[PDB]
Write a protein that binds this ligand. Structure first.
Ligand SMILES: NCCCCCC(O)(P(=O)(O)O)P(=O)(O)O
Ligand SMILES: [Cl-]
Ligand SMILES: [Mn+2]
Ligand SMILES: [Mn+2]
Ligand SMILES: [Mn+2]
Ligand SMILES: [Mn+2]
Length: 294
Protein backbone atom coordinates (compact mmCIF):
# COMPACT_ATOMS: atom_id res chain seq x y z
CA UNK A 1 0.00 0.00 0.00
CA UNK A 2 2.86 2.35 0.90
CA UNK A 3 6.17 2.26 -0.94
CA UNK A 4 7.50 5.84 -0.94
CA UNK A 5 7.55 6.80 2.72
CA UNK A 6 8.27 5.70 6.25
CA UNK A 7 6.27 6.22 9.43
CA UNK A 8 7.77 8.75 11.70
CA UNK A 9 8.28 7.64 15.28
CA UNK A 10 5.71 9.23 17.65
CA UNK A 11 8.13 9.74 20.53
CA UNK A 12 10.04 12.16 18.35
CA UNK A 13 7.42 14.71 17.47
CA UNK A 14 4.63 16.69 19.05
CA UNK A 15 1.04 16.17 17.91
CA UNK A 16 -0.67 18.17 20.64
CA UNK A 17 -3.33 15.50 20.47
CA UNK A 18 -4.43 17.24 17.33
CA UNK A 19 -4.44 14.20 15.07
CA UNK A 20 -5.20 11.29 17.35
CA UNK A 21 -5.36 8.22 15.16
CA UNK A 22 -3.02 9.05 12.29
CA UNK A 23 0.50 7.87 11.62
CA UNK A 24 3.06 10.38 10.49
CA UNK A 25 4.78 9.48 7.26
CA UNK A 26 7.70 11.27 5.62
CA UNK A 27 8.25 11.14 1.88
CA UNK A 28 11.68 9.52 1.91
CA UNK A 29 12.64 11.88 -0.92
CA UNK A 30 12.17 15.10 0.96
CA UNK A 31 15.14 16.77 -0.71
CA UNK A 32 13.23 16.71 -3.97
CA UNK A 33 10.77 18.96 -2.26
CA UNK A 34 13.77 21.06 -1.32
CA UNK A 35 14.96 21.48 -4.84
CA UNK A 36 11.55 21.93 -6.43
CA UNK A 37 10.66 24.60 -3.97
CA UNK A 38 13.89 26.52 -4.21
CA UNK A 39 13.84 26.59 -7.97
CA UNK A 40 10.52 28.32 -7.62
CA UNK A 41 12.26 30.82 -5.36
CA UNK A 42 14.86 31.38 -7.99
CA UNK A 43 12.25 31.63 -10.69
CA UNK A 44 10.26 34.09 -8.68
CA UNK A 45 13.37 36.03 -7.90
CA UNK A 46 14.11 35.77 -11.58
CA UNK A 47 10.86 36.75 -13.15
CA UNK A 48 8.53 38.75 -10.90
CA UNK A 49 10.16 39.94 -7.67
CA UNK A 50 12.81 39.38 -4.97
CA UNK A 51 12.77 35.93 -3.37
CA UNK A 52 15.50 34.56 -1.16
CA UNK A 53 15.19 32.00 1.61
CA UNK A 54 11.42 32.21 1.67
CA UNK A 55 9.37 30.68 4.44
CA UNK A 56 6.86 28.50 2.65
CA UNK A 57 6.49 24.75 2.25
CA UNK A 58 9.95 23.95 3.60
CA UNK A 59 10.79 22.87 7.11
CA UNK A 60 14.18 21.84 8.41
CA UNK A 61 12.75 18.53 9.54
CA UNK A 62 9.26 18.41 8.18
CA UNK A 63 8.71 20.01 4.84
CA UNK A 64 5.05 20.13 3.99
CA UNK A 65 4.47 17.89 0.99
CA UNK A 66 7.19 15.46 2.06
CA UNK A 67 5.02 14.92 5.09
CA UNK A 68 1.59 15.93 3.81
CA UNK A 69 1.90 13.84 0.66
CA UNK A 70 4.59 11.35 1.56
CA UNK A 71 3.60 8.66 -0.94
CA UNK A 72 3.87 11.12 -3.80
CA UNK A 73 5.38 9.56 -6.88
CA UNK A 74 9.06 10.41 -6.60
CA UNK A 75 9.45 11.62 -10.17
CA UNK A 76 6.64 14.05 -9.50
CA UNK A 77 7.88 15.26 -6.13
CA UNK A 78 9.87 18.30 -7.29
CA UNK A 79 7.29 19.88 -9.55
CA UNK A 80 4.58 19.46 -6.92
CA UNK A 81 6.74 21.26 -4.43
CA UNK A 82 7.44 23.76 -7.11
CA UNK A 83 3.72 24.27 -7.34
CA UNK A 84 3.04 24.45 -3.65
CA UNK A 85 5.59 27.19 -3.08
CA UNK A 86 4.19 29.23 -5.87
CA UNK A 87 0.87 28.63 -4.22
CA UNK A 88 2.40 29.63 -0.90
CA UNK A 89 3.64 32.71 -2.69
CA UNK A 90 0.36 33.80 -4.46
CA UNK A 91 -1.20 33.67 -1.07
CA UNK A 92 1.14 36.04 0.74
CA UNK A 93 0.40 38.44 -2.05
CA UNK A 94 -3.32 37.99 -1.44
CA UNK A 95 -2.92 38.42 2.38
CA UNK A 96 3.35 41.26 -14.98
CA UNK A 97 5.47 38.41 -16.32
CA UNK A 98 3.97 35.57 -14.29
CA UNK A 99 1.80 33.86 -16.92
CA UNK A 100 5.14 32.31 -17.83
CA UNK A 101 4.33 29.46 -15.46
CA UNK A 102 3.09 27.31 -18.25
CA UNK A 103 6.62 25.99 -18.31
CA UNK A 104 5.28 24.43 -15.19
CA UNK A 105 2.12 23.41 -17.01
CA UNK A 106 4.15 22.14 -19.90
CA UNK A 107 6.31 20.20 -17.49
CA UNK A 108 3.30 18.14 -16.53
CA UNK A 109 2.12 17.01 -19.92
CA UNK A 110 5.58 15.55 -20.37
CA UNK A 111 4.69 13.35 -17.46
CA UNK A 112 0.98 12.78 -17.30
CA UNK A 113 -1.16 14.47 -19.92
CA UNK A 114 -4.55 13.55 -18.53
CA UNK A 115 -3.69 14.07 -14.88
CA UNK A 116 -2.35 17.43 -15.89
CA UNK A 117 -5.42 18.62 -17.77
CA UNK A 118 -7.70 17.71 -14.88
CA UNK A 119 -5.57 19.40 -12.27
CA UNK A 120 -5.17 22.44 -14.47
CA UNK A 121 -8.83 22.43 -15.21
CA UNK A 122 -9.31 21.70 -11.55
CA UNK A 123 -7.72 25.06 -10.94
CA UNK A 124 -10.57 27.18 -12.19
CA UNK A 125 -11.60 29.68 -9.53
CA UNK A 126 -15.19 39.24 4.59
CA UNK A 127 -15.46 39.72 8.35
CA UNK A 128 -17.43 36.68 9.52
CA UNK A 129 -18.55 36.38 13.13
CA UNK A 130 -20.21 33.02 13.51
CA UNK A 131 -18.42 29.78 12.98
CA UNK A 132 -21.24 28.33 10.96
CA UNK A 133 -20.61 30.98 8.35
CA UNK A 134 -16.85 31.02 8.32
CA UNK A 135 -16.53 27.28 7.73
CA UNK A 136 -17.91 27.51 4.17
CA UNK A 137 -15.55 30.34 3.29
CA UNK A 138 -12.23 29.20 4.75
CA UNK A 139 -12.65 25.66 3.50
CA UNK A 140 -11.61 27.10 0.17
CA UNK A 141 -9.57 30.09 1.40
CA UNK A 142 -7.24 27.30 2.44
CA UNK A 143 -7.46 25.82 -1.05
CA UNK A 144 -9.57 22.70 -1.38
CA UNK A 145 -9.68 22.53 -5.15
CA UNK A 146 -5.98 23.28 -5.51
CA UNK A 147 -4.92 20.63 -3.07
CA UNK A 148 -7.28 18.24 -4.68
CA UNK A 149 -5.86 18.83 -8.14
CA UNK A 150 -2.45 18.70 -6.57
CA UNK A 151 -2.58 15.32 -4.85
CA UNK A 152 -4.41 13.45 -7.58
CA UNK A 153 -1.60 14.17 -9.94
CA UNK A 154 1.26 13.29 -7.59
CA UNK A 155 -0.57 10.08 -6.83
CA UNK A 156 -1.58 9.69 -10.45
CA UNK A 157 -5.21 9.36 -9.54
CA UNK A 158 -8.03 9.27 -12.07
CA UNK A 159 -11.42 9.82 -10.62
CA UNK A 160 -14.44 9.84 -12.95
CA UNK A 161 -16.03 13.25 -13.25
CA UNK A 162 -19.14 12.19 -11.38
CA UNK A 163 -17.68 11.37 -7.98
CA UNK A 164 -16.29 14.89 -8.09
CA UNK A 165 -19.57 16.07 -6.69
CA UNK A 166 -19.36 13.35 -4.07
CA UNK A 167 -15.76 13.47 -2.99
CA UNK A 168 -15.89 16.88 -1.43
CA UNK A 169 -18.87 15.92 0.68
CA UNK A 170 -16.74 13.26 2.21
CA UNK A 171 -13.76 15.34 3.30
CA UNK A 172 -15.67 18.10 5.01
CA UNK A 173 -14.45 17.14 8.47
CA UNK A 174 -10.93 16.82 7.07
CA UNK A 175 -10.78 20.16 5.36
CA UNK A 176 -12.49 21.54 8.39
CA UNK A 177 -9.83 20.26 10.72
CA UNK A 178 -6.90 21.55 8.73
CA UNK A 179 -8.48 24.94 8.24
CA UNK A 180 -8.56 25.44 11.99
CA UNK A 181 -5.09 24.14 12.38
CA UNK A 182 -3.74 26.71 10.00
CA UNK A 183 -5.76 29.35 11.77
CA UNK A 184 -4.25 28.32 15.04
CA UNK A 185 -0.71 28.44 13.83
CA UNK A 186 -0.96 31.09 11.19
CA UNK A 187 -2.81 33.07 13.81
CA UNK A 188 -0.09 35.39 15.12
CA UNK A 189 1.06 35.89 11.54
CA UNK A 190 -2.41 36.62 10.30
CA UNK A 191 -3.06 38.56 13.49
CA UNK A 192 -0.18 40.99 13.28
CA UNK A 193 -1.32 41.35 9.67
CA UNK A 194 -4.80 42.65 10.38
CA UNK A 195 -3.19 44.98 12.87
CA UNK A 196 -1.34 46.74 10.03
CA UNK A 197 -3.97 47.23 7.33
CA UNK A 198 -5.89 48.66 10.27
CA UNK A 199 -8.58 46.00 10.04
CA UNK A 200 -11.19 45.77 12.78
CA UNK A 201 -11.45 42.05 12.19
CA UNK A 202 -9.21 39.12 11.45
CA UNK A 203 -10.46 36.58 8.93
CA UNK A 204 -9.36 33.79 11.27
CA UNK A 205 -11.43 31.33 13.23
CA UNK A 206 -9.80 32.46 16.46
CA UNK A 207 -11.14 35.94 15.91
CA UNK A 208 -14.52 34.72 14.86
CA UNK A 209 -14.73 32.59 17.96
CA UNK A 210 -13.77 35.48 20.20
CA UNK A 211 -16.68 37.37 18.75
CA UNK A 212 -19.18 34.54 18.51
CA UNK A 213 -18.36 33.54 22.09
CA UNK A 214 -17.66 36.79 23.96
CA UNK A 215 -14.36 35.27 24.94
CA UNK A 216 -10.70 36.24 24.97
CA UNK A 217 -7.87 34.90 22.87
CA UNK A 218 -7.06 32.02 25.17
CA UNK A 219 -10.71 31.01 25.29
CA UNK A 220 -10.91 30.95 21.50
CA UNK A 221 -7.95 28.62 21.21
CA UNK A 222 -9.09 25.99 23.68
CA UNK A 223 -12.39 25.72 21.94
CA UNK A 224 -10.96 25.62 18.49
CA UNK A 225 -8.59 22.95 19.70
CA UNK A 226 -11.48 21.11 21.35
CA UNK A 227 -13.22 21.36 17.99
CA UNK A 228 -10.46 20.23 15.70
CA UNK A 229 -10.17 17.09 17.79
CA UNK A 230 -13.83 16.40 17.16
CA UNK A 231 -13.77 16.92 13.40
CA UNK A 232 -10.86 14.57 13.41
CA UNK A 233 -13.02 11.78 14.65
CA UNK A 234 -15.87 12.86 12.45
CA UNK A 235 -13.65 12.25 9.48
CA UNK A 236 -12.14 9.06 10.86
CA UNK A 237 -15.70 7.74 11.08
CA UNK A 238 -15.98 8.14 7.36
CA UNK A 239 -12.94 6.03 6.64
CA UNK A 240 -14.17 2.90 8.37
CA UNK A 241 -17.55 3.22 6.72
CA UNK A 242 -16.16 4.00 3.30
CA UNK A 243 -13.48 1.33 3.54
CA UNK A 244 -15.39 -1.15 1.40
CA UNK A 245 -17.94 0.21 -1.07
CA UNK A 246 -16.98 -0.64 -4.64
CA UNK A 247 -19.21 1.97 -6.14
CA UNK A 248 -16.39 4.14 -4.84
CA UNK A 249 -13.35 4.79 -6.99
CA UNK A 250 -10.32 2.82 -6.04
CA UNK A 251 -8.62 6.17 -6.57
CA UNK A 252 -11.12 8.06 -4.48
CA UNK A 253 -10.77 5.53 -1.73
CA UNK A 254 -7.03 5.97 -2.16
CA UNK A 255 -7.38 9.73 -2.18
CA UNK A 256 -9.45 9.53 0.94
CA UNK A 257 -6.93 7.44 2.79
CA UNK A 258 -4.23 9.79 1.58
CA UNK A 259 -5.99 12.73 3.18
CA UNK A 260 -5.24 11.32 6.61
CA UNK A 261 -1.61 12.16 6.26
CA UNK A 262 -2.16 15.67 5.05
CA UNK A 263 -3.77 16.10 8.42
CA UNK A 264 -1.03 14.53 10.44
CA UNK A 265 1.35 16.29 8.09
CA UNK A 266 -0.17 19.71 8.61
CA UNK A 267 0.23 19.39 12.36
CA UNK A 268 3.93 18.62 12.65
CA UNK A 269 4.84 20.90 9.79
CA UNK A 270 2.89 23.85 11.14
CA UNK A 271 4.39 23.16 14.53
CA UNK A 272 7.73 23.70 12.88
CA UNK A 273 7.46 25.51 9.54
CA UNK A 274 9.63 28.64 9.55
CA UNK A 275 6.62 30.16 7.90
CA UNK A 276 4.63 30.08 11.11
CA UNK A 277 7.71 29.78 13.27
CA UNK A 278 10.22 32.50 12.39
CA UNK A 279 12.76 31.40 15.01
CA UNK A 280 13.04 28.19 13.07
CA UNK A 281 16.05 27.87 10.81
CA UNK A 282 16.55 25.53 7.85
CA UNK A 283 19.00 22.74 7.04
CA UNK A 284 22.59 23.05 6.11
CA UNK A 285 21.37 21.33 3.02
CA UNK A 286 18.37 23.55 2.63
CA UNK A 287 20.37 26.70 3.00
CA UNK A 288 23.39 25.59 0.98
CA UNK A 289 21.00 25.52 -1.96
CA UNK A 290 19.23 28.76 -1.10
CA UNK A 291 22.36 30.79 -0.68
CA UNK A 292 24.61 29.16 -3.28
CA UNK A 293 23.45 26.03 -5.00
CA UNK A 294 20.40 24.81 -6.89
N1 LIG B 1 -2.89 23.25 2.17
C1 LIG B 1 -2.29 23.80 3.41
C2 LIG B 1 -1.80 25.22 3.15
C3 LIG B 1 -2.05 26.06 4.39
C4 LIG B 1 -1.93 27.52 4.02
C5 LIG B 1 -2.87 28.40 4.84
C6 LIG B 1 -2.57 29.83 4.44
O1 LIG B 1 -2.02 29.73 3.12
P1 LIG B 1 -1.45 30.70 5.54
O2 LIG B 1 -2.16 30.69 6.88
O3 LIG B 1 -0.19 29.90 5.52
O4 LIG B 1 -1.39 32.06 4.87
P2 LIG B 1 -4.05 30.85 4.45
O5 LIG B 1 -3.51 32.25 4.36
O6 LIG B 1 -4.81 30.46 3.21
O7 LIG B 1 -4.69 30.56 5.78
CL1 LIG C 1 1.94 16.24 21.91
MN1 LIG D 1 2.61 12.10 21.04
MN1 LIG E 1 -2.15 33.35 4.00
MN1 LIG F 1 -4.49 33.34 2.23
MN1 LIG G 1 -3.81 31.01 7.67
Amino acid sequence: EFKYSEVVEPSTYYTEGLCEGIDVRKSKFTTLEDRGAIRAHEDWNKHIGPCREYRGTLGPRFSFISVAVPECIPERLEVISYANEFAFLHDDVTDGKKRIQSQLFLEMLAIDPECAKTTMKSWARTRFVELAKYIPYRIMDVGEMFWFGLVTFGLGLHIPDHELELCRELMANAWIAVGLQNDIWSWPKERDAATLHGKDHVVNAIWVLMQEHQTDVDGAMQICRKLIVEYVAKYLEVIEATKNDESISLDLRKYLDAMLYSISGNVVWSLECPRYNPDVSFNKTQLEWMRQGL
